[PDB]
């Protein structure tokens with residue numbers, strides 16, 4: 340008959356086999372991650388090969404249906420996803436060459452190691468020692484040398500391979516109808532076919548630039564305050580008007596500024612909020628923490644976990660011969676199986692992480708009724724935002740007081756709020772310019788406007804421009820600094836970390852408004868409220884069946900991302916920082932160079 | 936999973952013939968627009984209710 344009926348018939352078959360094959364591959368992956376053995380690796384390879392191969396023929400078979408004869412707009416989305424994400428266009432020699440390069444990227448990053456100067460006796464890896472040194476050690480020479488050493492021994496090797504990598508990816512996009520591999524990433528937010536909700540790929544760049552323009556005053560004021568405080572630690576090296584040295588950010592790349600909290604405490608005399616001792620006194624175990632997290636979700640109206648989750652999931656490190664990765668993850672094996680993989684200690688961070696991970700599971704259960712190809716968030720940012728909005732409420736003093744970990748004798752005044760806001764600021768506000776800088780440079784390099792001989796040249800020029808950080812040692816084109824990043828080497832989109840942060844504060848402000856809350860924004864709880872829960876659940880169950888612009892409208896009431904809720908969250912900190920910056924110059928100077 | 940029409944009350948059907956969906960009759964062989972009518976459950980102890 341017509342194409343519509345034939346397409347529906349084909350989809351009703353694809354869904355059935357896709358569910359079973361996905362379960363087999365996902366279960367094999369879970370088995371290895373909880374049981375590290377060679378045969379488990381083989382099981383992953385076999386199951387992964389079958390799933391990868393099966394997608395190939397289905398992608399080939401889906402080509403016979405032209406997409407201009409579909410008007411339901413729901414079948415079209417499924418057909419578009421199936422055709423795109425399994426189609427291969429490069430030649431066999433080029434395809435295997437790209438695969439070999441990608442395998443080389445992961446292998447060299449995992450096996451990369453640097454160690455002490457002029458001493459090949461003992462050497463260490465990045466995760467065990469390098470992270471600890473840059474997070475705790477305050478030695479100027481050690482931090483500067485280690486920062487230079489890792490880049491020299493990694494970026495130089497990765498430079499020529501990246502040059503071959505950027506090429507092959509371009510003809511992949513060139514063979515398709517996309518302009519360049521940069522536009523291929525920007526196609527995730529593309530929306531077409533709906534009047535009043537269409538979003539163009541090029542609109543994202545303008546929207547990102549406009550949003551970053553408004554958040555500039557907050558960042559520079561924080562930068563000025565950070566520079567003044569760091570003057571006490573390293574007076575001679577730091578200039579009152581120059582950019583901060585790149586090796587004094589508390590981490591390997593300066594992505595997060597959390598490690599500087601102790602060195603930049605606003606009021607150290609006043610006690611800090613901590614409940615680790617309280618849990619120790621009350622003898623809290625892993626199950627008690629998760630039950631408390633589960634009760635929080637019930638209090639808003641969302642259903643709680645099934646029996647299969649409790650029996651199958653593991654929350655403690657097995658130890659002994661049984662070795663497993665302790666990276667917290669939320670597994671959705673499909674067909675009604677949800678599990679959480681993490682090693683739990685009796686700490687406040689693990690208590691908050693339990694709430695953060697449980698949010699992903701609840702989101703996964705929300706769209707279980709949707710078809711297989713539409714079981715995902717509206718975009719790459721919604722999934723991350725949902726799991727982060729709930730960690731904000733869990734850390735509020737009111738929730739802790741209601742549970743009982745915090746004594747009722749606790750009081751709130753100037754310092755308690757200011758210290759809490761500044762601690763959050765060094766984690767949230769600081770990473771935004773770094774994420775935008777990396778994405779914009781990587782967009783430009785894929786555009787091809789920058790020649791290869793100016794890759795390192797332009798990289799540091801804009802670092803002193805936007806981020807306001809100057810390198811401590813000059814580098815030539817031999818080094819490839821961006822290749823030292825984990826996400827860059829492993830071919831992962833990085834813009835999702837900028838849209839997520841601005842999304843979460845839009846959600847929290849809306850829910851607090853629906854919860855009839857009054858007072859400062861940062862002190863908000865939604866435990867008893869149920870109107871907020873049902874409003875959130877309406878968007879969660881949608882899945883990918885609707886454009887993300889419509890989903891955003893159904894929660895807040897706008898068709899685009901906004902920066903006002905984020906600024907309103909940190910407004911009390913903004914006024915105090917303005918007072919503290921009366922005698923301190925605002926703005927960094929790009930002319931200064933630490934190496935004379 | 937695929938039948939030409941509906942079933943009368945209290946009726947059974949056992950015939951197994953390739954359900955043609957495309958215009959071209961594929962003479963009862965597996966291929967495009969020609970799917971087997973009998974699908975299969977899969978059952979494991981780790982499923983959910």
Ligand SMILES: *[C@@H]1O[C@H](CO)[C@@H](O[C@@H]2O[C@H](CO)[C@@H](O[C@@H]3O[C@H](CO[C@H]4O[C@H](CO)[C@@H](O)[C@H](O)[C@@H]4O)[C@@H](O)[C@H](O[C@H]4O[C@H](CO)[C@@H](O)[C@H](O)[C@@H]4O)[C@@H]3O)[C@H](O)[C@H]2NC(C)=O)[C@H](O)[C@H]1NC(C)=O
Pocket residue numbers: 420424666667668669670696699712723830831
């Ligand atoms: C189309 O085809 C592509 C690829 O062929 C598929 O894309 C994948 O989609 C999944 C689902 O999002 C991606 O998985 C995500 O990877 C992120 C990257 O993290 C890496 O690094 C960490 C270490 O830091 C590793 O542990 C991790 O395994 C990755 O190697 C993760 O960060 C994501 O996890 C996030 O969510 C969980 C909850 O689910 C949280 O607990 C986490 O903290 C975190 O916030 C997530 O796992 C995957 O990366 C994509 N592939 C690629 C190559 O990018 C599509 O699924 C497919 N479309 C289909 C099938 O319809």
Ligand SMILES: *[C@@H]1O[C@H](CO)[C@@H](O[C@@H]2O[C@H](CO)[C@@H](O[C@@H]3O[C@H](CO)[C@@H](O)[C@H](O)[C@@H]3O)[C@H](O)[C@H]2NC(C)=O)[C@H](O)[C@H]1NC(C)=O
Pocket residue numbers: 347411413414
């Ligand atoms: C686009 O295609 C989809 C899928 O074919 C269409 O969804 C279908 O919508 C109809 C009614 O709108 C559903 O019928 C309902 O079935 C349930 C039993 O499941 C019955 O109880 C109801 O009374 C009703 O008859 C149908 O199930 C549903 N398809 C699927 C797979 O769930 C959609 O309508 C199409 N778009 C347009 C604009 O027609």
Ligand SMILES: *[C@@H]1O[C@H](CO)[C@@H](O[C@@H]2O[C@H](CO)[C@@H](O)[C@H](O)[C@H]2NC(C)=O)[C@H](O)[C@H]1NC(C)=O
Pocket residue numbers: 638737738740741742864865866867
């Ligand atoms: C949500 O409702 C529960 C049920 O009353 C609240 O739990 C009580 O909290 C008070 C503190 O105000 C305690 O004195 C009670 O002992 C608690 N009762 C129980 C059964 O736990 C909870 O505090 C409410 N949430 C919020 C944020 O107020």
Ligand SMILES: *[C@@H]1O[C@H](CO)[C@@H](O)[C@H](O)[C@H]1NC(C)=O
Pocket residue numbers: 374376661
């Ligand atoms: C892990 O793999 C080994 C090797 O086959 C097996 O004997 C064991 O039962 C598996 N599970 C655990 C929990 O060790």
Ligand SMILES: *[C@@H]1O[C@H](CO)[C@@H](O)[C@H](O)[C@H]1NC(C)=O
Pocket residue numbers: 637641642643
């Ligand atoms: C939450 O779990 C309890 C069992 O501990 C169960 O009795 C209750 O029904 C669950 N909540 C909902 C909303 O079903």
Ligand SMILES: *[C@@H]1O[C@H](CO)[C@@H](O)[C@H](O)[C@H]1NC(C)=O
Pocket residue numbers: 752753915
């Ligand atoms: C502390 O808060 C009180 C609120 O009554 C306010 O009057 C005072 O100015 C604040 N102090 C500072 C240093 O912000």
